[PDB]
From a paper:
Cellular compartments maintain a reducing environment by constant recycling of oxidized antioxidants back to their reduced forms, a reaction catalyzed by glutathione reductase (GR) in the case of oxidized glutathione (GSSG) and dehydroascorbate reductase (DHAR) for dehydroascorbate (DHA), the oxidized form of AsA11. Whereas GSH is relatively stable in its oxidized form, DHA undergoes irreversible hydrolysis to diketogluonate (DKG), and therefore, rapid reduction of DHA in cells is critical for effective AsA recycling. Previously, DHAR has been reported to have a bi-uni-uni-uni ping-pong enzymatic mechanism, with GSH and DHA interacting with the catalytic cysteine (Cys20 in AtDHAR2) in separate, sequential binding events. AtDHAR2 crystallized as a monomer and exhibited the classic structural architecture common to the GST super-family, with an all-helical C-terminal domain, and a thioredoxin-like N-terminal domain consisting of a mixture of β-sheets and α-helices.
The crystal structure of AtDHAR2 in complex with GSH was solved by molecular replacement to a resolution of 2.3 Å in space group P21221. GSH was placed into the available electron density of the mFO-DFC difference map at the G-site of AtDHAR2 at full occupancy in a non-covalently bound state. The cysteinyl sulfur of GSH was in close proximity (2.8 Å) to the sulfur atom of Cys20, thereby indicating that the GSH was likely engaged in a mixed disulfide (for which a maximum bond length of 2.3 Å is commonly applied) with Cys20 before disulfide cleavage by X-ray irradiation, a well-characterized phenomenon. The GSH γ-glutamyl is particularly well stabilized, as evidenced by low B-factor values of 24–29 Å2, accepts H-bonds to its carboxylate from a water molecule and from the backbone amide and side-chain hydroxyl of Ser73, and forms a salt bridge interaction with Asp72 via its amine group. The central cysteinyl region of the GSH molecule is stabilized by hydrogen bonding of the carbonyl and amide of the cysteine with the backbone amide and carbonyl groups of Val60. The glycinyl group of GSH is less tightly bound, as reflected by elevated B-factors of 39–48 Å2, forming a single salt bridge with the side-chain amine of Lys47 through its carboxylate. The overall structural fold of AtDHAR2 is almost identical to that of the structures of OsDHAR1 and PgDHAR1, albeit with the inclusion of an additional short-chain helical turn preceding the α1-helix. The introduction of the α1’-helix in AtDHAR2 alters the peptide torsion of Asp19 in such a way as to re-direct its side-chain carboxylate toward the protein interior, forming a hydrogen bond with His160. However, although Lys8 is conserved in AtDHAR2, it is instead positioned at the beginning of the β1-strand, distal from the active site cleft and 19 Å Cα-Cα from the positioning of Lys8 of OsDHAR1, and the equivalent position occupied by a glycine.
Residue numbers in the entry: 5 to 211
Write the structure that this text describes.
Amino acid sequence: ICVKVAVGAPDVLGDCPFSQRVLLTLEEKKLPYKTHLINVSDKPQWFLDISPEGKVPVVKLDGKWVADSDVIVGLLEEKYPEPSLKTPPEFASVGSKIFGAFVTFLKSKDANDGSEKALVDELEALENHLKTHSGPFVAGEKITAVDLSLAPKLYHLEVALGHYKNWSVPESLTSVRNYAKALFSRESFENTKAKKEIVVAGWESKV
Ligand SMILES: N[C@@H](CCC(=O)N[C@@H](CS)C(=O)NCC(=O)O)C(=O)O
């Protein structure tokens, strides 16, 4: 068994945290996979045929192409249940606004707009959960789907805000920092992350 994954070429689309979420899921389930790069920044109709919104990642499972990383990891969970990555529904929303807050802050040219505070507000909510719930991960001792969704977002956050704004996560958010190190140090992450240079380049137009 070998899962086909369509991701963006680093030169044309950058690094995608939603693609790395899928790849992490395959790694953690030890599912073999082959990565096919999509060279196009445009949307040729054969690509919109496999992916209605013209987005990566897309995955080929059971001879059919399926887009959307939320759908993809859920379908991989149903097809390959061991090891289980099911996140208990009550933790599904943990960290959910962080990535969006980071993009606004990264984009912002007005240091007075409140974007930085909005991001710290979301990081603090993650910190509250991690300090008051057994770790290392959001749901406990075992890694689950919510952790593989957050990890590439935390990675892009730290890399991109460190380069474009020499901004780092506040030192007082020690649980968040231990959480990211625990995720970044995993074999699945080291084998699916992009060079910092790719991350930085992917975001240059937005800054
Ligand atoms: N909700 C989708 C989001 C996927 C997504 O937005 N991918 C971006 C790259 S990070 C993309 O393909 N953008 C294509 C474009 O419109 O340029 C998912 O989880 O897979």
